[PDB]
Design a protein around this ligand. Structure first.
Ligand SMILES: Cc1cc2nc3c(=O)[nH]c(=O)nc-3n(C[C@H](O)[C@H](O)[C@H](O)COP(=O)(O)OP(=O)(O)OC[C@H]3O[C@@H](n4cnc5c(N)ncnc54)[C@H](O)[C@@H]3O)c2cc1C
Ligand SMILES: Cc1cc2nc3c(=O)[nH]c(=O)nc-3n(C[C@H](O)[C@H](O)[C@H](O)COP(=O)(O)OP(=O)(O)OC[C@H]3O[C@@H](n4cnc5c(N)ncnc54)[C@H](O)[C@@H]3O)c2cc1C
Lengths: 367, 367
C-alpha cells in the first residue's frame, strides 16, 4: 500500500518524488511513456544531448531553486540568444540595440527609442486587447511585421488580431546591446542533460514505465492513499465538457556528417511562408567536439486527441472550460492536480519546480 | 612584532591577509595610496560604481575561486560583450558569427570560415616579417584593417608594419553567434564593487594608508618576521639595472544628466584617427537606476619610469632585465615577491587570487 502514487515523471512529479522519498513516504511513479523526464527529456546521440521536445533552457532568480538543481547535476553558463530569420534578413533576439541597429542602422539608445515610439503613432493609445496590439505597443510596426506576426501566426495557427494580448510570455525589450533572452540572475543547461537530472530526483524510487494511469484509473487509485496527478486535467474527466485547446508540435530530426550547421542553438523563422517555426542545433547548448551534428526542424499544428499538448490557448472560451474541470477536481478526494497539463498553463521549469516544492510542504504541514 | 607585513592592498596582498588572518598570524598591511584595492579599486558616484583604473570583469573556470569571492560579495551575471566602432560601422567583438555577418553578410559557419581561411593566405605561407603580416595571417585583411590595425597602432605608438609580430600571438575566432568575450564557466561583476570585496578580505586586519614602504624600508621591515612584497620589483632594488618597460593609459571621466549614453559597458574605437581607444559606461557593469551616467574615455599614454604601469611590454629586452632582478630577489630572504608588479607580468584577477592562495599554502607548508 503506497502513501503516494505519482502520475507522470516530468519535473512536477519527479520533484514531488524527490522530496517525499526523503520524508520516508512510500512512493510509486507511473509514467505512460517509455522514458522519464516529460517534456524536458533529453537523449544522447554519440555525445550530443538532444532536446527531444523543444529547446529547454533553465533560468531563475531564485537562488534556492538554482542550487536545488545544481546540487544534483552541474549546469554550464549557456546564455540563450535566439536568432530570427525573416526572408533574406538575420536579426538578433530578444529586442535589443543589436536588433534595432540591424533594423535601422541606429547606434544611439535614445534614437532607437524615439523610432519605436514613433511607429506606434498610427495606432494611437487604446488599451491593447489582442496580441497584435500588445506587440505593436511594445516594439512598433517594423519589428512586429518582421519578427512577430508570421511567427505568431504559424505557432498559434490563428490571426494575431484574434489572440489574447498575453497569450505569449513577453520577451525583453531593452536599449542596451545585449542578446540575452532571459533577464534572470541564473541561467544554464545541465551538463549531461535533463534526463540525468531527473534521474537523480527519481533515484531510489519505484518507477513504472509504459503505463497510462487513465486506462486503469480506479484500480490504480485504490493502491495508494493519495494520488498526485500531472496529466491533462480534461482527459482525467473523459473530456466530459469538451477538450481544452492546444497547439502541438512535430519535430523532424536529422543527423549531418559535418560539425556546425547554423552556428547557434536556436533560430526562429518568422516568415509565414516557411513551414517550420524553428531549427534547433542541439550541440550548441553544451560545448562538444563531434564530427557530426543533429538538427531539428520544429513545425506547429493544431492539437487533436493523441497528440502531445504543448501550448494551451489561454483565451476566455477555454478558461471557462478549465474552470468547469477545476470544479470537478476541487471535489476529487484523494487527488492533487499539479503541473503544466493538470493546471492548463504554460510553466517555466523553475516555476514548476517551485510549485512542486510548495505542494509537498503543504502536504506535510498536516496529512 | 608582526608575523607578516604585507606591502600593497591589491588582490594579491588582500588575499594573503585574508588567509593569514585565518591562521592566527599577526598581520600588517601597508599601502602607499589613500585607498585599498590596487588596480581593481572602484569608487561610488551617486550609486554608480566606477572602475577607476580600467574596466574589470571577473572570470574563472575554478569553482573554488568563484565561490571564494562569492562568499564575500555576491556577483551578478554580467557578460562582457565589447563593441567596436570603425568609422560609421559598428561591430560585435570578439570575432564571432555576428562579426562576420556584419562584415560580409554571411550567415553560414562554413561559408564564414572559407572567407577567412582564404584571406589569411593573401601572402601565402610567407612567415610574418612584422605585426601587420602577423595579424593578416591570423584573421585576414578585412577584419584586420577594420578591427585590429588602428587600435593596435594607437595603443603602441605607430605603424603595424613597424612593429614586432610577437605583440599579437593569437586572435580568437569562433564560428558560432556568440558575443561572450570570455569562454570561462564563471563570469560576473561584484554587486557593490571591487572595493567592497577587498574590504571584506581585509576585515579585522591592521591597514596603514598613504605609506610607501620603500621610503622607510628598515624600520618597517623590523616590525615583522616576514615581508610579502607586491610592489614594482625593479623599484624595490632602486632601478639598479634600469627600469622595466610598461605601456600606460590615461582616463578622462564625465558625468552626464541622462541615464544611457551608449548602451554598453565597453566600446572600442579601432580607427587610428580617433584619439581614445575605448569609452566605458560604468553603470552597465551592474544594473542600477540613476538619472545620470558616468562615461570614461581611455587614451594610450606614452610611458616613462614614473607613470602608472598598466601593461608590461614583456619583450626579450625587458624579460632579460627581469631575470636580473629576480636573481637579486632570490638572494633576499624573509621577503616574498608576488603580484603583477612584483613579478613583471600581466595577471587576470582569478590568476592572481590563485597565486596568492598557493603562495600562502607554500608559506605554511615550509615553516
Ligand atoms: C516546446 C517547449 C519548450 C520549453 N522550453 C522551456 C525553456 O526553455 N525553459 C523552461 O524553463 N521551460 C521550458 N518549457 C516548459 C517545461 O517543458 C515545463 O515547465 C515542464 O515540462 C513542466 O513539468 P510537468 O511535469 O508539469 O509537465 P511534463 O514535463 O509535461 O510532464 C508530465 C508527464 O506526465 C506523463 N503523463 C501524462 N498523462 C499521463 C497518464 N495518464 N499516465 C501516466 N503518465 C502520464 C507524461 O508522459 C509526461 O512525462 C518548454 C515547454 C515546451 C512545450
Ligand atoms: C587596464 C586593466 C584592466 C584589467 N581588466 C581585467 C579584467 O577585466 N579581468 C581580470 O580578471 N583582470 C583584469 N586586470 C588585471 C588586474 O588588474 C590584476 O589582476 C590585479 O590588479 C592584480 O593584483 P595585484 O595585487 O597583483 O596588483 P595591484 O592591484 O596593482 O596592487 C598592488 C598594490 O600595492 C600598492 N603598492 C605598490 N608599491 C607599493 C609600495 N612600495 N609601498 C606600499 N604600497 C605599494 C599599490 O598602490 C597597489 O594598491 C586588468 C588590469 C589592467 C591594468
Amino acid at each position: 500500500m503506497y502513501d503516494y502514487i505519482i502520475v507522470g515523471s516530468g519535473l512536477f512529479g519527479a520533484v514531488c518524488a524527490n522530496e517525499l522519498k526523503k520524508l520516508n513516504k512510500k512512493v510509486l511513479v507511473i509514467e505512460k511513456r517509455n522514458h522519464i523526464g516529460g517534456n524536458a527529456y533529453t537523449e544522447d546521440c554519440e555525445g550530443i544531448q538532444i532536446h527531444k521536445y523543444g529547446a529547454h533552457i533553465f533560468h531563475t532568480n531564485d537562488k534556492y531553486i538554482w542550487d536545488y538543481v545544481n546540487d544534483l547535476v552541474e549546469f554550464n553558463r549557456f546564455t540563450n540568444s535566439p536568432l530570427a530569420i525573416y526572408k533574406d534578413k538575420l536579426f538578433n533576439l530578444p529586442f535589443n540595440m543589436n536588433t534595432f541597429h540591424q533594423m535601422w542602422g541606429v547606434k544611439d539608445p535614445q534614437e532607437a527609442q524615439n523610432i519605436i515610439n514613433a511607429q506606434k503613432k498610427k495606432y494611437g493609445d487604446k488599451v491593447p486587447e489582442n496580441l497584435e496590439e500588445q506587440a505593436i505597443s511594445l516594439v512598433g510596426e517594423d519589428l512586429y511585421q518582421a519578427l512577430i506576426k508570421g511567427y505568431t501566426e504559424k505557432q498559434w495557427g490563428r490571426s494575431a488580431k484574434e489572440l489574447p494580448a498575453f497569450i505569449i510570455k513577453r520577451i525583453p525589450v531593452r536599449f542596451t546591446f545585449d542578446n540575452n533572452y532571459f533577464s534572470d540572475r541564473y541561467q544554464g543547461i545541465p551538463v549531461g542533460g535533463y534526463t540525468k537530472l531527473i534521474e537523480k530526483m527519481l533515484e531510489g524510487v519505484d518507477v513504472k514505465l509504459g503505463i497510462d494511469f487513465l486506462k486503469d484509473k480506479d484500480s490504480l487509485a485504490s493502491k495508494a492513499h493519495r494520488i498526485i496527478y500531472t496529466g491533462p486535467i480534461d482527459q482525467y474527466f473523459d473530456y466530459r465538457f469538451g477538450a481544452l485547446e492546444y497547439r502541438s508540435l512535430k519535430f523532424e530530426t536529422e543527423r549531418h556528417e559535418f560539425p556546425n550547421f547554423q552556428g547557434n542553438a536556436v533560430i526562429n523563422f518568422t516568415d509565414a511562408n516557411v513551414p517550420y517555426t524553428r531549427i534547433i542545433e542541439h550541440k550548441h547548448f553544451d560545448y562538444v567536439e563531434t564530427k557530426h551534428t543533429v538538427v531539428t526542424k520544429e513545425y506547429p499544428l493544431e492539437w487533436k486527441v493523441g497528440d502531445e499538448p504543448y501550448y494551451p490557448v489561454n483565451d476566455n472560451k477555454n478558461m471557462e472550460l478549465f474552470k468547469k474541470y477545476r470544479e470537478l477536481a476541487s471535489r476529487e478526494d484523494k487527488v492533487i492536480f499539479g503541473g503544466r497539463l493538470a493546471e492548463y498553463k504554460y510553466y517555466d521549469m523553475h516555476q514548476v519546480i517551485s510549485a512542486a516544492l510548495y505542494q509537498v510542504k503543504n502536504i506535510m504541514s498536516t496529512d
